[model samples]
Target: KEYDAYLSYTKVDCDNPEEEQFALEVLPDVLEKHYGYKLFIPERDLIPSGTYMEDLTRYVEQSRRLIIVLTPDYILRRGWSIFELESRLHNMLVSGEIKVILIECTELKGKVNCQEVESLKRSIKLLSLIKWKGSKSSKLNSKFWKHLVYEMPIK
Candidate 1:
């Protein structure tokens, strides 16, 4: 089957030279090994200099799924990531296209939730995982991915 999802992540990961390399190295292989799906990673061609938000909004509008990688840093950045989420939510509300997946990298212990940002919080149940022995083991399985693929209105 052709790819049906777009992976939206914080560019802060890309901003750091080390983290960016890590992302580039790990993400594609993981998706291929497990889901057998291609990911739409944003690039310079996808987003021109001054129009990142507009370009991303356009991309989300076209995508069937919006997979958000939510972390403490992602939540804290409070700029493009939030904008992407909101735009995706708006499109989802109207056309029922976008889907959110929150990949938690850190504990949300002392974090303040943004009321304005429509996250996966109330809508979709999160799937938690623990990285052990160089792999992520989670109760969330292929069934979850299947459900995520077919679930419309994505709540």
Candidate 2:
């Protein structure tokens, strides 16, 4: 299937207000400008009181490309993130229609535990960063977006 959209899954930091704002404000815009495609962000829809996981899983399954933003908090709060990763991997294996983009948001230099997901062995594409410093540009180029589009296999 032709990739239709991009989904961003990140560990929401309730403690640091700035980080949350950055993730909400900067990241999506950067992704949109760079990719020129629809990017799915969680904040758009309010998760019902007891259905966070269910709602998230539904969205993940629907998306053609899933972007997992990895941070220290992500690994520590491994329940939801792990579940999401596993679900995506399962879908990929069964349907052969999911593409993953792993974004390293922190300096996870020697963090072995963060790299323990069995799905990583399948040659999942990765995008890493040493820090969360927001990008400076605001333009989307066809070249970058084309590369990303080509990475996804269409059925």
Candidate 3:
């Protein structure tokens, strides 16, 4: 596989700064640099190999898991995060090769409006999410980190 997980996220979820740092810096640092997992983050990994859609299609297929940081901005209208989510969902539904791990930041309870999408609904309902608990969640000994690693593919 080209990557262990494809990080699906958007910058600036809200005025809260911890959420952005957790998703952008802490998460990737622990997962890749410390835990030895290869991550494909779209924001930092976009290359000259293909168009935006083309690369996303291939990256989602190659990754073992889709690590979605479920912030308020993630499902915003005309956002790339939505497109990324859709691409991974399609692969998961059709191929059954990739998994989705949702790390909810701002509690998407009353914030997002895409409940019509059953797959996302199911994922949320099933409680397959790791709720980021501010600084505590970023700790090396945090259960959040442990749970995240458990979901990751074995090296």
Candidate 4:
């Protein structure tokens, strides 16, 4: 597979606000265009009508890394976001492979649920984690993105 990264995200409904879309929507293309890396984002890269879990596992299996775009909804607990994280972590527990990057998409404000996703909490302990931040600035020159791309395949 030419795809070397899986951009993991929460299931987005049509009703989701455009503000919510800002993170996941913009990230794949940004990562691709600037970094020359291929990321498998379900809506953008895969057949939208396929069985989600089956298709997801295939794409995740094909990738070397998982970049989790964490929004407020993400930490509040969602379906496939944590599911994909768990599945990939379980694979790493067995095979000792893959890299996981956590990117916080919004400013962590007051009174949000701090309750952690168990699989992710456990998985985070297994490796020296690398996380990035998002910005309100232009994506092209965002300090957050500048730091994020500092680590890469360098191929």
TM-score of each: 0.56, 0.56, 0.79, 0.69
Name every residue pair that clashes in candidate 4. Answer: none
Candidate 2 deviant stretches above 4 angstroms: 1-6, 11-22, 33-35, 49-51, 79-89, 93-95, 110-155
lDDT by residue (tens digit), candidate 3, 8-92: 8777525446677787788899999888999998878886664767767877778878787865566553233444366564545
Native-vs-model 2 lDDT? 0.50
Give me the candidate number with maximum lDDT. Answer: 3
C-alpha lDDT values of all predictions: 0.47, 0.50, 0.70, 0.59
Residues 56-153, model 4: lDDT tens digits: 77677777676766666665555335344556546663354666666655554534333444455464533323344433533567766665665444
- Which candidate would rank higher by TM-score, 3 or 4? 3
Strongest candidate by TM-score = 3
- Give the TM-score (vs. native) of candidate 3: 0.79
lDDT of 1 by residue, 1-155 (tens): 12345665566522233334333445544564565665567752374659766666666666655565544445566533443366555545344344454444444554355553445344433323222111232223544344443332222
After superposition on all CA atoms, what RMSD does each candidate show versus the true structure?
6.3, 5.4, 3.5, 4.0
Which scores greater on TM-score, model 2 or model 3?
3
- Of the two candidates 1 and 4, the one with more favorable TM-score, higher being better, is 4
Q: What total of clashing residue pairs does each candidate reach?
A: 0, 2, 0, 0
Candidate 1 regions exceeding 4 Å error are 1-3, 11-24, 33-35, 79-95, 111-120, 123-134, 138-155
Q: Using TM-score as the measure, what is the rank order of every candidate, best first?
A: 3, 4, 2, 1
Residue pairs with colliding backbones in model 3 are none
